[PDB]
Chains A and B, each alone.
Chain A
Amino acid sequence: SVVQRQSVSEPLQTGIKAIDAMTPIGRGQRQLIIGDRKTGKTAVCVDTILNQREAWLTGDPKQQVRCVY
Chain B
Amino acid sequence: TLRELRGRIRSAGSIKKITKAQELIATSRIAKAQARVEAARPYAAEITN
Q: A contacts B directly in the complex (CB < 8 Å)?
A: no
